[PDB]
Design a protein around this nucleic acid. Structure first.
Ligand SMILES: [Mg+2]
Ligand SMILES: [Zn+2]
Lengths: 190, 202, 163, 52
RNA sequence: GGUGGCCAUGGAAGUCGGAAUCCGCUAAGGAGUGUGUAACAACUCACCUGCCGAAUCAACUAGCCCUGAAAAUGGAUGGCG
């Protein structure tokens, strides 16, 4: 069954100014500017609210499986807005029995340098993506802070080091060591 | 359960709205099942506590009885956990005052309420140094032999201002137990009247 | 008991269940009993004399501490008295036909049971507890020639004498 | 050794998992269905074994 | 809660197992779904509430595809597609 219409309005705050080039949404607030293309999903993105109050995504002659996606675009747009207003912060706390996982950021964000996970001589290196500023925390012991505007980029990068730090040929029930994400949040909370 | 048993509850609420003209609206946010067992037996001589759900917005259907009116002023308060306690013998505050038992206390970060909170310059009795929740804020303290003191005083947080997490946790470490008023009383009804617990009401 | 290791009388409560004669198989309370200045043997065998002259079918047992004095009271439990309201005591070494035996009246002795249900119940007055402790059966099965079954529905007594 | 809240972080990420009985593929706690095309999307799931 | 309920004691006080097996407070809480615990607790789940606003859910049965599905000179809806 094709559903004649499905739609959704995103409520855009007074801080930000989205401006869509056809289908491609660009978002600029305090923090910076983000962009993303929905040159796949195939919907009608209107900016109906004057002053500038609403993104409305339509979908229109759509069967079930594209009706899904109405809401997913609607999300990557909120998720941009939160990114360019507040900005995200994933915290990730290192975990162990014994060998201290020994982290050291090494340009600005960029290189996250890990000696000694489980006594291993090989020093794992991990790049961040562009726009992702890693930094070793304070007010807490074994704990990184990945700051960035883009969720997509910030959470590969969590996951890259969370996955770079995996044990092999053991019980990972027992060997519960490595670095992993403890708290997805924001820089500014409001 | 539940086209008959529902339609049953309906006949017991409509009863106590007629028979019992004195209504006490109670907030039981934190409660135990052994707690209420004891409160009903401690007030068995007096009151009748009545616990329901959403449906309590059926004062409309007793008000529909081509009959009662001022039950419109009961409409804004059937919201966010509430029950009523119907009593014959009331007689004003004097049974209402003896009901207030031990409880919050509590105190949490993100709260607002009652009056200006004070911590009389008294010697604390906590383990030594333990000055870091005072040093974080700013009060003049001294180790006289072993245990800790405040050798000065003021109001920590004033009315309308938010209580921080460190200033909340230090207050419940000291045993000073303010900011609370849940399971006690929210809004009385007695003969179409509108009482208000800011203070004449008692 | 409080900053530094203090006490200030001994009036402290401990509760136990079960009872043949007493205990004595390198055993009684321990854990709670030993640190407490009690023992394992004299304050065990003086728990005989009071929990005795008939209790030999499991008990509940509050022992009040005073310096090194262990007061051995038998506080009645609702099912324990209803097992002792039986056509009673056969005891041990037969027994064997077992303790699902089950035929015992307690017509007004369940009134005396629901009377001696001291505080515990937070009670509607008899006519509901009469049914609570009437409903907890498995052995007896109600009054001379009846079943608990049909007392639950009604009870044309007690009600206005117990308030 | 390894602080409780810290541990039960890692546990959340390596231990509380459902698992497909067909393909042994490892799944989140809520799964009523597998991900994998190979097993045929099974529903034959079990919890991953808690270490003794 | 009545409540180390009864059987079982080896522990099973709701819980290796079973007969069973019902009241109070009721609001609603099974003499218990489980975790697990020697047993508890502590936790959880039924039950029932608090907050939200209108559609929601379950078992079948079929259509279409996915799996079951593993063979030897290279590779055949006829090929191309
Ligand atoms: Mg191995
Ligand atoms: Zn699978």
């Amino acid at each position: 069954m094709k559903t004649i219409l499905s739609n959704q309005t995103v409520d855009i705050p007074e801080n930000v100014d989205i401006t869509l080039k056809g289908r491609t949404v660009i978002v600029k607030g305090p923090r910076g500017t983000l962009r993303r293309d929905f040159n796949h999903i195939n919907v009608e993105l209107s900016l109906l609210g004057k002053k500038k109050k609403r993104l409305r995504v339509d979908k229109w002659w759509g069967n079930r499986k594209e009706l899904a996606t109405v809401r997913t675009i609607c999300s990557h747009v909120q998720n941009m807005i939160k990114g360019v207003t507040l900005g995200f912060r994933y915290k990730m706390r290192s975990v162990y029995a014994h060998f201290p996982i020994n982290v050291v950021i090494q340009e600005n964000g960029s290189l996250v340098e890990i000696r000694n996970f489980l006594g291993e001589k090989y020093i794992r290196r991990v790049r961040m993506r562009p726009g992702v500023a890693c930094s070793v925390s304070q007010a807490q012991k074994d704990e990184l802070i990945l700051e960035g505007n883009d969720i997509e980029l910030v959470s590969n990068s969590a996951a890259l080091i969370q996955q770079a730090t995996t044990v092999k040929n053991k019980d990972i029930r027992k060997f519960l060591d490595g670095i992993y994400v403890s708290e997805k949040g924001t820089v500014q909370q409001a | 359960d539940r086209a008959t048993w529902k339609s049953n509850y309906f006949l017991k609420i409509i009863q106590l709205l007629d028979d019992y003209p004195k209504c006490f609206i109670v907030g039981a946010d934190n409660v135990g099942s052994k707690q209420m067992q004891q409160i009903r037996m401690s007030l068995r001589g007096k009151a009748v506590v009545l616990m329901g759900k959403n449906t309590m917005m059926r004062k409309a259907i007793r008000g529909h009885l081509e009959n009662n009116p001022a039950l419109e002023k009961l409409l804004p308060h059937i919201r966010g956990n509430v029950g009523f306690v119907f009593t014959k013998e009331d007689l004003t505050e004097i049974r209402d005052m003896l009901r207030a038992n031990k409880v919050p206390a509590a105190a949490r970060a993100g709260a607002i309420a009652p009056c200006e909170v004070t911590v009389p310059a008294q010697n604390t009795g906590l383990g030594p140094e333990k000055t870091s929740f005072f040093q974080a804020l700013g009060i003049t303290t001294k180790i006289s032999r072993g245990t800790i003191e405040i050798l000065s005083d003021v109001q920590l947080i004033k009315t309308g201002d938010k209580v921080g997490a460190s200033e909340a946790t230090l207050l419940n470490m000291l045993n000073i137990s303010p900011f609370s008023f849940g399971l006690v009383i929210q809004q009385v009804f007695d003969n179409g009247s509108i009482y208000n617990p800011e203070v004449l009401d008692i | 008991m409080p900053p530094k290791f203090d006490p200030n009388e001994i009036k402290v409560v401990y509760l136990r269940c079960t009872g043949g004669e007493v205990g004595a198989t390198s055993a009684l309370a321990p854990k709670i009993g030993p640190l407490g200045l009690s023992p394992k043997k004299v304050g065990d065998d003086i728990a005989k004399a009071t929990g005795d002259w008939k209790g030999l079918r499991i008990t509940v047992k509050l022992t009040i501490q005073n310096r090194q004095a262990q007061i051995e009271v038998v506080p009645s439990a609702s099912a324990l008295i209803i097992k002792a309201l039986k056509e009673p005591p056969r005891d041990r070494k037969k027994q064997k036909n077992i303790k699902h035996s089950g035929n015992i009246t307690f017509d007004e002795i369940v009134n005396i049971a629901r009377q001696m249900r001291h505080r515990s119940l937070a009670r509607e007055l008899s006519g509901t507890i009469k049914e609570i402790l009437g409903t907890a059966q498995s052995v007896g099965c109600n009054v001379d020639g009846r079943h608990p079954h049909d007392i639950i529905d009604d009870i044309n007594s007690g009600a206005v004498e117990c308030p | 050794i390894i602080e409780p809240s810290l541990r039960q972080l890692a546990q959340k990420y390596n231990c509380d998992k459902m698992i497909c009985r067909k393909c042994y593929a490892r799944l989140h706690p809520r799964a009523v269905n597998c991900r994998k095309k190979k097993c045929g999307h099974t529903n034959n799931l079990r919890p991953k074994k808690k270490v003794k």
